[PDB]
Amino acid sequence: SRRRVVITGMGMLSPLGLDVPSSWEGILAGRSGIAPIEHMDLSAYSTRFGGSVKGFNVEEYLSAKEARKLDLFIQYGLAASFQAVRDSGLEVTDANRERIGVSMGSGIGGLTNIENNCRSLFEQGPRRISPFFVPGSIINMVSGFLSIHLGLQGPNYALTTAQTTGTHSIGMAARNIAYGEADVMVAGGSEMAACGLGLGGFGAARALSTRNDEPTRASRPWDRDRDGFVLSDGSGALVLEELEHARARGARIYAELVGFGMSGDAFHMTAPPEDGAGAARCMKNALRDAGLDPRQVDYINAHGTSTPAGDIAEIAAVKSVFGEHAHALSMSSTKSMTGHLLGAAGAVEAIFSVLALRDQVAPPTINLDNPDEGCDLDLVAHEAKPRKIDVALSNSFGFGGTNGTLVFRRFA
């Protein structure tokens, strides 16, 4: 039957740093990775800032010759994938390669790449479209390229479920191992949507904070002055591993993955139900899946996108699932500092959640100066809060009424 699943490796690019420890240091210090965007000219855009990955050197991972053929999202996913695999100390052999797979996803994928070849197509013509446009841009090629580079011959796929992609990717990889389709999976996601179509598209839908004159205070989840999410780039990857396999080889285990929930809201293409009915169903499935009393949950890492409707939905979802225990746990949004990595949001927040467990600290919600109507839970405003965390939960919600929950606990 169902095997248990532990975290043996983590890798990350965020607007807070080029690895996990540097990113985490910023999280505990309540530092913002949000700044005006420099790689393009956004004077015609209603939003001109985001969470860029700053100082990324792809030639720490790939030959410039390969890197040139690949969209930044693919570069970011490989960067985090390679970190996580090295962090696991796992050796890939002919003996285990067929039992090691990969599920790295993206919400949008190679939008910069499609934008640039679109430029070439319209300004010059079809014959200037790169021969590398398809394999360098489509979402499954983080899983593809990682498998080619490392010899991973296990299950090879990618999810695209918008802002839920990282949680879905991690959770379903765990089910791969749980049910014995694999002993190891590299799982998470990557996003680089900070191009014309991305900032314009989200801008057109009026979803983005337009606080161009103070980018670091734009992402203010549950604050009454919130005006949309902040668009950020990066990657999260975890090495998920069957528990006995991890023990046999003496792997360092950060935490166990005990619970995964999915659920459609069936409510609206882009709007979350104000009652949190979808988040509620999802967390309930995931806590059942983990065989837990909801009162065991100590820390929740919220979706916490800093949109009006999304944030309030999540208070209502947590009050409804946890009843009075909603006032005992701590809930925070690391999106306060990183902004919204979209399909990678689930991945980086999975790792922040595992790190709350290791270090016994609730990350802060920075910029929560004036909590909104009903937002009366412990939201770890401003400053990290050292506390007892046995069980941590990470929530994601996306367009299509798509929901995911991951439940982690300490392994000893």
Ligand X SMILES: CC(=O)N1Cc2ccc(N)cc2C1
Which C-beta is closer to a second copy: that of 66 or that of 378?
A: 66
Of 52-60, 167-175, 232-240, 326-334, the window that binds a second copy (rule: CB under 8 A) is: 167-175
Closest CB 67 distance from a second copy, rounded Å:
13
Does residue 269 bind a second copy (CB under 8 A)?
Answer: yes
Does residue 157 bind ligand X (CB under 6 A)?
Answer: no
Which C-beta is closer to ligand X: that of 120 or that of 153?
A: 153
How many Å apart are CA 114 and CA 101, to the nearest integer? 28
Output the CA–CA distances (angstroms, integers) from residue 66 to 70, 222, 308, in the order listed: 7, 43, 42
> From the list a second copy, ligand X, none, which binds 147 (C-beta under 5 to 8 Å, kind-based)?
a second copy
Does residue 203 bind a second copy (CB under 8 A)?
Answer: yes
Of 2-10, 80-88, 178-186, 299-307, the window that binds ligand X (rule: CB under 6 A) is: 80-88
CA angle, corner 173, sides to 169 and 178, nearest 5? 145
Contact predicate 245/178, CB 8 Å: no
Does residue 295 bind ligand X (CB under 6 A)?
Answer: no
Contact predicate 331/378, CB 8 Å: yes
Does residue 153 bind a second copy (CB under 8 A)?
Answer: yes
Of 78-86, 93-101, 171-179, 261-269, the window that binds ligand X (rule: CB under 6 A) is: 78-86
Among 121, 243, 316, 384, binds a second copy (CB under 8 A): 121
Q: Which residue is nearest to ligand X (CB)?
A: 82
Closest CB 172 distance from a second copy, rounded Å:
7
- Which residue type is seen at 268? H
Among 73, 76, 82, 299, binds ligand X (CB under 6 A): 82
**In sequence order, what E strands does 208-264 have?**
234-242, 255-264
Does residue 156 bind a second copy (CB under 8 A)?
Answer: yes
- Tokens standing for 35? 């700044």
- Tokens standing for 312? 């309030």
**Residues 6 or more apart in contact with residue 148 via CB below 8 angstroms:** none
**Which of the residues 45 through 64 are near ligand X (CB under 6 A)?**
60-61
Q: Burial of 127 by CB count in 10 Å (0-12 exposed, 13-18 middle, 19+ buried)? A: exposed
| Torsion over CA: 368, 27, 191, 278 (sign) | negative
Does residue 199 bind a second copy (CB under 8 A)?
Answer: yes
